[PDB]
């Protein structure tokens, strides 16, 4: 089974600097790096067989280590306009799973996460003013999946608010605890609040 | 360089039925090889972009069998038989005949199902946000179809726009429902100033208004 692990990326202001890559598991083979934004949509940027997107040369430095198979993307003096998530690519058979770049003059600002309580019982979580994106969340560590609602982020005057809602039998809250666990990587956040009713 | 050209929405389809989407090339992608290099991928929710069909009409490892695309070297389209809830997601059209490498914008596959009335929920302001010195009104309207829905918010019987943040889920691949988080915030200070908060949602469901209140004097 190939598997395309990729990592790195995070936040810089505009002009900083930033090395993501990925590793290929499972000498043969293309590695490219495709970015994904909601303004551009998926859009190519870089190739070693090394090739350059009009718009990133000079940028970007494509390169790999084939004995770890472990390629590299150097991302200096980044411009707003590269934000983005970034997939290792092997055309055309293989995807990363992503990592997100932001370039912005914004600085990284951790969540505050507040617990929502009031036959199914609905509770929620509020994750607000926080930046870069992603934060991650999760209820009873996974074990509620089922009925979850996590809603995308919204940017407001320069911070991001996410929710997210669960919902459960009655039966099962207050009397059994519920949790959302709340982490944010960009701010070394990790939260584990607990829904306790009124 | 080539350009991919998809719509951004396939017709809506219901399940068990047969779904089409189209993709056209700028330059053709057929070769004197009698090869097509024509390549789809889904992007499911969340989740990265995976392969589909490569060189045209070849099945990628591990994809349904009810998947398929025929075309010539610039109209292609992909076909998904009986399609089930799970093959919600962006479809992407792709080449590989010269740099740079380039995608279509992708086309949302449109599930239609039976109507659902929105679940809705609201819930006032924590004690801990409460303590930071902001107030946050919070409405989820959950699992609700078809997809359009308007929010409006009251506090004490009058309408407030500003404070409001709306966000959307994508159509869930279990049920082909949405959903909708409808938060307005205020602060401490105006927050224990008013008595009712309240949201209402109108959805082609119901020619009556859902709506959920709370008033902090109960």
């Known amino acids: 089974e190939v598997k395309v692990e990729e990592s790195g990326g995070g936040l810089v202001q505009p002009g900083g600097s930033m090395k993501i890559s990925c590793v290929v598991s499972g000498s043969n083979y293309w590695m490219s790096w495709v970015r994904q934004s909601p303004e551009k949509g998926l859009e190519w940027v870089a190739e070693?067989?090394?090739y350059y997107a009009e718009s990133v040369k000079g940028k970007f430095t494509i390169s790999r280590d084939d004995s770890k198979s472990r390629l590299y993307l150097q991302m200096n003096n980044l411009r707003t306009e590269d934000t983005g998530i970034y997939y290792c690519?092997?055309?055309?058979?293989?995807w990363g799973q992503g990592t997100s770049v932001t370039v912005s003059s914004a600085k990284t600002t951790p969540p505050s996460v507040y617990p929502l309580a009031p036959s199914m019982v609905t509770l929620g979580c509020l994750v607000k003013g926080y930046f870069p994106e992603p934060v991650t969340v999760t209820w009873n560590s996974g074990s509620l999946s089922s009925g979850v609602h996590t809603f995308p982020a919204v940017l407001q005057s320069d911070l991001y608010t996410l929710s997210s809602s669960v919902t459960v039998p009655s039966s099962t809250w207050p009397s059994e605890t519920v949790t959302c666990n709340v982490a944010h990587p960009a701010s070394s956040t990790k939260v584990d609040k607990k829904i306790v009713p009124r | 360089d080539i350009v991919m050209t998809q719509a951004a929405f396939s017709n809506p389809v219901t399940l068990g039925t047969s779904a089409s989407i189209s993709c056209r090339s700028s330059k053709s992608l057929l070769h004197s090889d009698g090869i097509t290099y024509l390549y789809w991928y889904l992007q499911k929710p969340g989740q990265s972009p995976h392969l589909l069909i490569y060189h045209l009409s070849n099945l990628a490892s591990g994809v349904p069998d009810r998947f398929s695309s025929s075309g010539s070297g610039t109209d292609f389209t992909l076909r998904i038989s009986r399609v089930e809830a799970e093959d919600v997601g962006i479809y992407y059209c792709?080449?590989?005949?010269?740099?740079?490498?380039?995608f279509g914008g992708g086309t949302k596959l449109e599930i239609k199902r039976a109507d659902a009335a929105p679940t809705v929920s609201i819930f006032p302001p924590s004690s801990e946000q409460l303590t930071s010195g902001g107030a946050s009104v919070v409405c989820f309207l959950n699992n609700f179809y078809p997809k359009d829905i308007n929010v409006k918010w009251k506090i004490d019987g009058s309408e407030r726009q500003n404070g409001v943040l709306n966000s959307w889920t994508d159509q869930d691949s279990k049920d082909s429902t949405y959903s909708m988080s409808s938060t307005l915030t205020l602060t401490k200070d105006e927050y224990e100033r008013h008595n009712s908060y309240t949201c209402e949602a109108t959805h082609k469901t119901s020619t009556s208004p859902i709506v959920k209140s709370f008033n902090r004097n109960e």
């Open positions: 070693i067989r090394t």
């Open positions: 792709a080449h590989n005949v010269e740099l740079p490498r380039t």
């Open positions: 690519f092997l055309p055309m058979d293989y």
